[PDB]
Design a protein around this ligand. Sequence first.
Ligand code: CLA
Ligand code: CLA
Ligand code: CLA
Ligand code: CLA
Ligand code: CLA
Ligand code: CLA
Ligand code: WVN
Ligand code: PQN
Ligand code: PQN
Ligand code: SF4
Ligand code: SF4
Ligand code: SF4
Lengths: 68, 151, 74, 73, 138, 74, 80, 742
Amino acid sequence: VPQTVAWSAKTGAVMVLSNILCIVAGRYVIQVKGSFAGFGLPELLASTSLGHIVGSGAILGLSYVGVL
Amino acid sequence: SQFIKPYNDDPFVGNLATPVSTSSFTKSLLSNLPAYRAGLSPLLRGVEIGLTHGYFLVGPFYKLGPLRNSDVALLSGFFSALGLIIILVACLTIYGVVSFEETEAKDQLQTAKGWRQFTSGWLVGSVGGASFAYILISNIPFLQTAGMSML
Amino acid sequence: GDFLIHHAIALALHTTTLILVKGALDARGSKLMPDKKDFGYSFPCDGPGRGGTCDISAWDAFYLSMFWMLNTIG
Amino acid sequence: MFLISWRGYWQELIETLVWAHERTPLANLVRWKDKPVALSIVQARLVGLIHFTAGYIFTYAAFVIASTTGKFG
Amino acid sequence: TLNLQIPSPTFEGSTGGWLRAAEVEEKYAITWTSPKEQVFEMPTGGAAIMRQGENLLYLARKEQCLALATQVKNSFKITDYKVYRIFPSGEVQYLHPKDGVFPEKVNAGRVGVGNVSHSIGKNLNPAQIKFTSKSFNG
Amino acid sequence: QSALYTHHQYIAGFLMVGAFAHGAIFFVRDYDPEQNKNNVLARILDHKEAIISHLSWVSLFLGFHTLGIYVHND
Amino acid sequence: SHSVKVYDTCIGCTQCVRACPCDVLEMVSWDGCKAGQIASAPRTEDCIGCKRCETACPTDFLSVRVYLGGETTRSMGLAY
Amino acid sequence: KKVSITVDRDPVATSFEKWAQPGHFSRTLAKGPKTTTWIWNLHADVHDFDSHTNSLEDISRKIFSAHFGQLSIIFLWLSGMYFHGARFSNYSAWLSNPTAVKPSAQVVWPIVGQEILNGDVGGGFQGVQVTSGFFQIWRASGITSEVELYWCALAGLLMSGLMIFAGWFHYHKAAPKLEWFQNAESMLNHHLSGLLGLGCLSWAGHQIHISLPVNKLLDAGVAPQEIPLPHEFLVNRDLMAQLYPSFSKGLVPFFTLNWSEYSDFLTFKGGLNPVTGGLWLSDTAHHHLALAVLFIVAGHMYRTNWGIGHSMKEILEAHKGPFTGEGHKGLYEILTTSWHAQLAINLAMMGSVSIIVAHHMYAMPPYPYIATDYPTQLSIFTHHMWIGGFCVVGGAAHAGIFMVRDYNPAQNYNNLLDRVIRHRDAIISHLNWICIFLGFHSFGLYIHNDTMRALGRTQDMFSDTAIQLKPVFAQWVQSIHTLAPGNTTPNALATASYAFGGDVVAVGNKVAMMPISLGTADFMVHHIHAFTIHVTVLILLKGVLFSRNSRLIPDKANLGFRFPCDGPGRGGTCQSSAWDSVFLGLFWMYNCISVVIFHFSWKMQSDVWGTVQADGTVTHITGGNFAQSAITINGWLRDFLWAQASQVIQSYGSALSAYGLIFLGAHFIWAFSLMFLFSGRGYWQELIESIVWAHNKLNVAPAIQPRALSITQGRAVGLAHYLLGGIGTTWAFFLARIISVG
Ligand code: CLA
Ligand code: CLA
Ligand code: CLA
Ligand code: CLA
Ligand code: CLA
Ligand code: CLA
Ligand SMILES: CC1=CCCC(C)(C)[C@H]1/C=C/C(C)=C/C=C/C(C)=C/C=C/C=C(C)/C=C/C=C(C)/C=C/C1=C(C)CCCC1(C)C
Ligand SMILES: CC1=C(C/C=C(\C)CCC[C@H](C)CCC[C@H](C)CCCC(C)C)C(=O)c2ccccc2C1=O
Ligand SMILES: CC1=C(C/C=C(\C)CCC[C@H](C)CCC[C@H](C)CCCC(C)C)C(=O)c2ccccc2C1=O
Ligand code: SF4
Ligand code: SF4
Ligand code: SF4
């Protein structure tokens, strides 16, 4: 079984970083919707959902490979 | 940027100009085949085609025939290939008899004299190629076992 | 068993006779095709009109009765 | 197959085959003298009947001779 | 007469077109005039776009040309179409409409071919006309 | 004995089918009604419907009850 | 070529000519029916034998009749 | 908003008036019968909604409500299966002794001696042995009593009533508009995330919370009557945590991404459970949970009222290259306007999925005690193979129906469909050539081997003791998949299935699963399968591509999808429609699936299924005869067809005698089918003329004039009785053989 870790500040740091990267990426790449004008609740929900998805994937991969 | 075009700039003929059908490589290969190459008599077209096909005809008969596990496998395979060559020559002869009317033109394949020359060349080339394949397999042990002699 | 197989044989003989006699007597014409004698003994059909006329000739009745003859000798 | 499948399918297949032979290099040098067509309706009925009848006869003859030989001969 | 210089509808080509028998035995031509550029279905399979004005098309069979004529008649209200037969020697034989008037309309000068002066039930039995060149119609 | 019986019985089926087929050909090609006015052949043709209907009735009779007895026994 | 006959039971409804895919039939002047017209077959060399005209004919047993005969390139529907 | 709910209220009044007017849906049929043809036309075109009206909205509403009616029928069937399992089955005795009690959920009444069909199935019970596999499903679901089956039947009946009420409401009271049906993006989002995703999530919940503890107690040897009820497993966390200690940690490891703590009840063990011979249920629980996560993620892809999401029209129009012209442009309009194109795609996919289900379910038995239930395995493989083949041919048929009816060349200029039509001759010619090549170099091997064995030349045959055709690629794939645990799948304890290689998993001295070696005969029969599938593809694709026109018939689209011919002209144009191509492709599908199931039955009976005895040797049912006999047609005829039909023809006087009766009856009906298949309409119409004369003589002619069945109906009736006869013959033979010897 791949090793997973209990919740810590590193896990929070990766998850927060993944959320902030996904918010900026959703700000830049979404075609149909000063820089944060038009930023709505569905776009925030979609970006933060991708942030949780990316953070979960990154946390599991780094816990597998030992970076923790 | 379209890669598929109507054939011969005629959209209503039953063909399409494709990279498989009408590229430079395909046209060069077809125009350099003996059946289409310019400057050849029908006899020499027959000689080249017969040499190639009669040369490759020896192999399956030698390797898979009923006498393949006997000491006379190559002789039987060559004789069977020669019989197939004679049958195909008879097919060519009856095709040329029924397909063409007797004309003065003899430099084209689709004439009676030209097809008779092509059949003669195909027979002579087929016998020569089959005999060459027989010689090569008889004299090279690598061909007798088809590569297991290296192991 | 001999009783049953002879009555089966009678069935097959009567049915083959039905096909063959119906082919011979309707060869000159029927309600679906009253001018069949103008078309000969063997022809494919009379077209999809009038409901469809597949296997209407007496040659086709021969063709259908051949299977029943094979069944009877079988 | 000659008694179940009928003509137009096979005729269109033969149209496709005629196109294939006419458009294939090194084979369009050879030309048929008679145009390839599907068998006619009456001809196809007869050919299916012939294959059917030959199968019937050969199957039963082989069965009766080999069975009688195996049991008694 | 058939004008060979009439431009053709814009077609990308297909494998369904005419074979060697069109250039060797006989070929068919259909011309028609359209009020606008519009997409029609080819009778050999595929979509082509006909130009505004005159259109000339080549086929292998007369039935393909008449199918196209029926299609453009019932879908584009085009009735001025003309169908010709062309031989390898270059002789052009006008086919449809033969006298300029469509065959479903009566025109003067037409003569009846194949008309029989009795009902079909008055045809002869074969036994009268066996070993004899008399027709079954009488 | 098996080969001889099977052979000549299949020949018999072929011959009887050929007899009816060539009779149908006789109706198609050779039957003159005007030379056969009120003949026995003409009267076959005039009650052909009764003949075919009664052949159908006896065929359906035989098949219904023979198949019913066989399936019943099974 | 197939043979197409038109018998005098024709009522001149022009349905057989409209049903013909090969332009074999045409309507000519006649005095035997109320419509004043009868079908005719001047172009039976183009007849494929499809019998769409026979399907289209509304008179009890047909007025137009197609007899299949010698097969040609046109009658066999060969595009080759 | 763009995705919204639009409904018309009371569009059709609920009345019995049209119930008394057969043919009301069709203007041609509403005039009433004049011939017997009318009746057949009434029952043949009734649910062909697009031919009755041109309004797409009414057609879509009819389709939606007919789908509700089918769902109601399926729920009634499921409720019936649960009730008949509850009241007329030996399910508790099977739960106590799975390895010795034959499942049986049908009991006959004693009327005419048919009570002999209530065979001794064990457990003190008499009934008809069932092979649908419901007992193993209920054991996997944790159903330990018949009371739960009664409640399942009640739930099924309530859902059937709910579906039929929903059909009546959503047609007759509140019918959705055409704009509601034309939301592909919303339908895919809801059906991916809610139907498949939440369904997988809730079933993973049921598996984790109910199925795993009950099945763990069952495999440990506890009797079902002392096992705690499922709600006790829900509320008593200690009772669960004795069996799975990670439940003592609660949902904190889930939300903190410490998921490996849950590694005891969500596993990736693979292989099979040694006690039951089925898949580990923890593996299935992680599997369905992962499928739930993947489906819910996939269900947020498509654009909706809010700005996020993909537009499928833009995706389709963006994918275009130099070889393909306009590319995938115009397909979104086709699939959002034509129901027939969607039916084609979905039938094709459901058929392929059913075939995948059959393969993957024989090879990896997912249910406890289903692997050693050889009749259940054979029945579900054969059944889902047949359903898959039928659905694939139906996808081809309804593709042809789209091509004839809904295709518009003006909206399809130089797209992929137009270019496919424009090189149809190349496609059909190359496929025809490869089909002839496959036929020669596959079937001529069998003919050649038959001749060589008949000529007394065994060394000239294609066999493993003669000139070999070794399946090196499939053997290499098997070696990779056997080597996959720990090398390319490091977290797997065992292989995905033992059919690729490994140990002999046996349950109750019967082989659950063992390695399935592939030799010369497997090579030949897999290339026979490839040949048959390519020929079926040739028939169906040629029918679809030439549905609108051809060189023969330039106006085939005007005649329609379903016509008998275009007359005897052009040499003969018989069976020129796409419908007749479907008619022939159904025969070839029958041949293909028949050869597939014959290969399956023989290969499992000869090399996989059998009894394990002392010193670990496996005695197979037919003693390993597949390797030397399946290389000739004579070997198939004698060692498979002749040998294994002994059980169905000697079943008379036993409980399996009904299969023998059905065997004979299918033998009857199939032959009866040839009477329609070989004959033609004119003969039967003239015979009907004579019978009409007979009825006229007694003044008993009916007012509705009897006519022979149509040419298309003759073909369809012959095909239907042919398929029924062949499938019933294989059904009776397979079931009698596998019940008797397995
Ligand atoms: C910090 C970043 C990070 C790191 C280091 C990793 C690292 C890893 N991830 Mg991971 N991941 C990340 C971010 C990261 N991921 C993100 C952001 C997500 C999105 C949520 C994921 C989602 C994810 C999933 C869902 C999974 C992983 C898995 C894995 C491990 C796989 C090891 C391997 O050899 O692959 C395997 C390599 C293969 C080649 C296997 C083949 C995989 C399938 C079968 C191929 C299917 C191809 C398909 C047929 C299409 C091909 C056809 C084509 C021509 C179109 C690896 C340690 C896997 C895992 O946990 O395993 C224990 C796993 O299942 N990752
Ligand atoms: C997430 C919401 C959702 C769900 C679950 C479904 C589910 C379904 N739709 Mg669907 N649909 C949706 C939204 C949804 N739709 C939307 C938004 C649209 C408009 C764009 C459509 C338009 C649509 C059409 C046009 C059609 C369907 C059809 C179907 C059925 C497919 C057949 C099948 O597998 O049944 C088996 C699956 C089941 C789950 C069986 C149970 C059936 C009931 C209805 C499920 C109810 C679940 C309920 C909401 C939650 C209660 C569960 C629990 C809490 C007690 C299936 C029941 C087809 C059909 O058959 O219609 C009748 C069909 O033709 N849908
Ligand atoms: C008990 C089992 C059994 C069963 C299931 C059947 C079943 C059948 N029989 Mg049957 N039959 C049986 C026993 C059975 N038979 C016995 C024991 C006899 C000997 C008397 C017969 C004598 C018999 C005859 C003579 C006929 C049938 C027919 C039929 C079929 C149509 C039913 C019918 O009459 O239509 C319902 C009735 C009508 C539609 C119209 C009424 C016609 C009836 C038969 C006339 C009866 C009165 C008449 C004056 C007597 C003439 C008989 C004469 C020729 C000797 C049907 C499959 C008929 C058949 O196969 O058709 C080809 C038929 O003609 N059966
Ligand atoms: C096993 C195959 C089989 C069977 C049963 C039949 C049956 C029949 N054929 Mg036939 N035929 C066949 C193969 C078969 N054919 C083949 C392969 C050919 C070659 C093309 C022909 C060619 C042929 C011709 C040319 C003629 C017939 C005729 C007949 C009928 C009269 C003969 C007879 O026995 O009447 C008795 C009928 C039967 C035994 C049929 C079975 C009756 C069933 C068992 C009654 C019960 C039905 C059941 C209750 C339905 C419930 C189903 C529901 C639950 C869905 C009969 C309907 C002749 C005819 O119509 O004569 C009037 C005729 O002219 N057939
Ligand atoms: C998802 C499933 C599905 C759906 C919704 C449809 C829907 C439709 N199809 Mg389609 N089809 C399907 C699957 C489907 N089909 C499959 C799988 C095949 C391949 C076999 C076909 C083959 C097919 C053809 C060839 C044709 C259609 C046609 C039609 C249309 C009208 C059907 C009609 O009125 O029949 C009304 C209902 C019936 C006639 C009942 C049929 C009863 C069957 C034949 C017998 C069942 C036997 C039973 C199971 C066993 C009894 C044995 C027992 C007595 C011992 C309609 C749009 C027709 C059409 O006009 O399309 C435009 C058409 O020509 N389809
Ligand atoms: C067992 C009977 C049988 C056989 C042998 C065939 C054979 C064939 N069918 Mg057919 N068919 C059959 C029954 C059969 N069908 C039935 C019952 C139906 C009912 C619906 C159909 C429906 C059907 C359709 C709808 C289609 C075919 C097609 C084909 C061809 C496929 C190409 C192929 O496999 O070439 C391989 C050839 C064989 C396997 C035949 C046996 C030859 C072997 C190799 C021995 C050769 C010996 C040698 C030539 C002898 C020389 C001796 C010398 C004296 C002459 C082929 C000619 C398809 C086609 O033509 O497209 C290509 C097609 O579209 N058939
Ligand atoms: C490999 C390659 C990889 C994959 C792709 C690929 C392109 C398909 C493939 C190429 C494949 C295939 C197509 C390979 C191409 C193959 C062919 C078969 C090669 C034939 C060579 C014939 C030569 C040796 C002989 C002439 C006889 C000599 C002159 C005669 C002496 C005689 C003359 C008359 C004078 C008297 C003495 C005698 C002895 C009687
Ligand atoms: C398969 C099939 C074909 C295809 C058959 C092709 C066209 C003929 C193939 C036969 C080859 C060319 C020769 C076969 C040689 C025979 C073994 C012997 C012929 C020589 C003797 C008669 C002397 C049809 O043309 C057809 C037409 C109408 C209805 C059904 C069908 C049909 O089912
Ligand atoms: C037998 C046969 C018929 C005759 C079938 C008749 C016309 C229809 C039979 C339907 C019956 C009436 C319904 C079911 C029969 C029941 C067993 C008893 C009848 C019950 C009555 C009260 C209706 C065809 O019309 C036909 C058409 C094209 C190719 C082949 C054939 C073909 O082989
Ligand atoms: S399907 Fe019937 S009516 Fe049509 S051409 Fe063939 S035999 Fe004639
Ligand atoms: S058979 Fe066809 S082509 Fe000939 S006249 Fe009649 S409709 Fe015209
Ligand atoms: S369809 Fe018949 S009635 Fe009408 S014009 Fe033609 S031949 Fe005369």
